[PDB]
């Protein structure tokens, strides 16, 4: 029975449906599940005001503001602001009751339904950790997590210290393992394994110890990328097995503790840290409280033999023969199997939802592809054609949007175009044709268009299950250029910038070089292009290698005339910045020399000196002051959440008092308690 001790079960337990049900409903200690429930509820209580947007609800759902929203289904609409505050209140109460274990089933539902409603209301708020919170709440809804360390058991003794079925731990462990393993498999991407995804990250001071034995490139490639990929691929296996659990726990704890400081990912790292002990024995909190000194052993509740529970069946040789598997047991086993199968399948289901497939696969948030794809957006142009007069106009990129994710997804772009066509009549624009010229570089590739700029997105066809025709393909046979691009970028001066552009055949780039962008040049790297100067109506054909100087404050056009995609460079200098810096340096040096033996230009120098002095002082300032400031900001966020929620709840229950009273209440809500 070596396999039995290594796995927790035997091969005979999987040879029949009845034995699988019996194994998956075997009684288990609920202490570990209870501690995880308490910690998850606490972290959700902390996260509702911060990341879920309770503190900025009045800004996001203002009751008269023109805004383009991006729900998963267009039939889903946000409620008025007071009702949105009620939804967030119900979600917060559900999180409170989940953390406490009080009215656990109702509290689970009361957190789950508004949480998923808020999730589906806005596709642009989707990420992997919010999706994980939804999944964890869904799982915990069906579990007996209030059998320990809960006030439900403190007000009802039968629920106290009652055993839970084994599938409660199996589903959660499978979820955590799936997160780790699918993240690792998604990191088996050419961009990640070649160190392109997160190449700036190694220069964080938290990676200093590795630099005592590695170079910058080596710690970027081996530690951040290969190290992260190995950790993701091996964390579930290390945590599952008893022999490797201490090492796995240490590595996973280090991973999450570094991630909490490297990134702003809400409470994800703490949720994963709290999920790690789910792989330990279900009795570990009991051992932890039994290892304490005897002086603190008379106030905690006595640790006795847990009582039998009805939620799980008992199979004994002496204690009767056995009992038939009840409907609840089969339902739990089937839920375990089906849910884990769905969790395995969904990250690789993008071949069905082709309409959500851009350069990357699917909507972001449920594939566990964290930090794999980095996007740099160079420029967005939104042009409309008036359907009545034929006049061409241009919109500010993102007028009525609260997010930038529409730049990368054809579904969000279609929603944005529909919203603009609905809203622009209010701005004296008849039925508009709207075109999008969006330039993106993904993982330091050539900047290129993601959508067809000649296609009217208002009338363009989009379907969930069909690949979008107006999405430009990613120029994959140009990635090996990245080493050369990086060499060019690092081989430049400190005042010059470079933009690398790849353009499709038959298309052209209309460019207005700013007046202050003197010394602007274009150099061809691949294919052939024709550069047209609009003012002089002159076309000069470029070949591979030649560089052309371009005028500032004037228009020019780059036509890709080659049958294959062309790549060219833009090297430019902020010449006004050069003049400003040289005159500022000369003025400062002359003044210093005269003294030792106001105007905006000197105002900039004074501001820079003051900022440098403040930065130096803050570095010299003890971290207790920084901690106090951080706590004050968080307390402001929580106080504002509470006060605006109270205002809206009173509006719902009693009514709106008056404009003056509401204004005074809102002013008091933003008071910045102790600044």
């Amino acid at each position: 029975s070596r396999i039995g001790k290594l796995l927790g079960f035997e091969w005979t337990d999987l040879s029949s449906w009845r034995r699988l049900v019996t194994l998956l409903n075997r009684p288990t200690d609920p202490a570990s599940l209870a501690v995880f429930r308490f910690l998850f509820g606490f972290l959700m209580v902390l996260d509702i005001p911060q990341e879920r947007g309770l503190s900025s609800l009045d800004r996001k759902y203002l009751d008269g503001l023109d805004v383009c929203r991006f729900p998963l289904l267009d039939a889903l609409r946000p409620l008025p602001l007071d009702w949105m505050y009620l939804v967030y209140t119900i979600m917060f109460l559900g999180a409170l009751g989940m953390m406490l274990g009080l009215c656990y089933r109702i509290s689970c539902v009361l957190f789950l339904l508004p949480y998923w409603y808020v999730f589906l209301l806005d596709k642009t708020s989707w990420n992997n950790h919010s999706y994980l919170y939804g999944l964890l709440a869904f799982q915990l809804t069906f579990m007996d997590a209030n059998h320990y360390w809960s006030v439900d058991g403190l007000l009802n003794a039968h629920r106290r210290n009652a055993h839970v079925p084994l599938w409660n731990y199996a589903v959660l462990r499978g979820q955590i393992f799936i997160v780790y393993f699918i993240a690792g498999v998604k990191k088996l991407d050419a961009d990640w394994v070649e160190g392109y995804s997160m190449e700036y990250l190694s220069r964080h001071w938290l990676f200093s110890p590795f630099k005592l034995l590695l170079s910058e490139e080596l710690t970027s490639l081996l530690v951040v990328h290969w190290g992260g990929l190995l950790l993701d691929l091996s964390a579930g296996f290390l945590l599952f097995f008893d022999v490797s659990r201490s090492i796995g726990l240490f590595f996973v704890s280090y991973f999450h503790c570094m991630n909490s400081q490297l990134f702003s990912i809400g409470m994800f790292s703490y949720v994963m840290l709290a999920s790690s002990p789910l792989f330990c024995s279900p009795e570990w909190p009991r051992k932890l409280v039994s290892y304490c000194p005897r002086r603190l052993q008379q106030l905690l509740p006595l640790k006795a033999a847990p009582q039998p529970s009805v939620s799980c069946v008992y199979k004994r040789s002496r204690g009767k023969s056995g009992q038939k598997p009840g409907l609840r047991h089969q339902l739990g086993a089937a839920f375990t199997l089906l849910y884990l199968l769905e969790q395995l399948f969904l990250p690789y289901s993008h071949f069905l939802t082709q309409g959500y497939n851009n350069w990357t696969n699917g909507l972001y948030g449920y594939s566990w592809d964290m930090m794999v794809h980095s996007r740099s957006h160079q420029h967005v142009k939104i042009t409309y054609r008036d359907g009545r007069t034929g006049e061409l106009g241009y919109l500010n990129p993102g007028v009525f949007t609260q997010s930038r994710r529409w730049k990368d997804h054809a579904d969000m772009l279609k929603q944005y175009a529909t919203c603009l066509s609905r809203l622009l009549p209010k701005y004296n624009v008849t039925e508009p044709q709207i075109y999008f010229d969006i330039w993106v570089s993904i993982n330091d590739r050539f900047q290129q268009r993601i959508f067809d700029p000649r296609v009217d997105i208002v009338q363009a066809a989009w379907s969930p299950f069909q690949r979008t025709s107006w999405v430009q393909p990613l120029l994959m046979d140009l990635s090996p250029w990245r080493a050369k691009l990086q060499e060019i970028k690092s081989s430049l001066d400190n005042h010059t910038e470079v933009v690398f552009i790849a353009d499709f055949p038959g298309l052209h780039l209309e460019n207005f070089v700013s007046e202050d962008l003197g010394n602007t040049s274009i150099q061809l790297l691949q294919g052939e292009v024709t550069v047209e100067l609009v003012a002089e109506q002159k076309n000069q054909t470029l070949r591979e290698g030649e560089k052309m100087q371009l005028p500032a404050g004037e228009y020019h056009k780059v036509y890709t005339t080659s049958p294959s995609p062309s790549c060219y460079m833009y090297v430019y200098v902020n010449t006004t910045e050069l003049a400003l810096e040289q005159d500022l340096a000369y003025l400062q040096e002359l003044k210093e020399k005269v003294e030792n033996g106001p105007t905006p230009l000197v105002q900039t120098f004074l501001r820079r000196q003051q900022r440098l002095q403040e930065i130096e002082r803050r570095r010299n300032t003890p971290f207790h002051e920084r901690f106090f400031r951080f706590l004050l900001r968080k307390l402001y966020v929580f106080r504002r959440s509470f006060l605006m929620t109270c205002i809206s709840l009173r509006n719902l229950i009693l009514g709106r008092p008056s404009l003056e009273q509401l204004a005074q209440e809102v002013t008091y809500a933003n008071l910045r308690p102790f600044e």
Partner: peptide
């Protein structure tokens, strides 16, 4: 503003906004 002119709409060689970290979709 709501509308841009032909001039400011076509200056691709502008400094990007760089609002926080607009590179990774995982960040808040």
């Amino acid at each position: 503003t709501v509308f841009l002119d032909h001039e400011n709409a076509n200056k691709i060689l502008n400094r990007p906004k760089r609002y926080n970290s607009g590179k990774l979709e995982e960040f808040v």
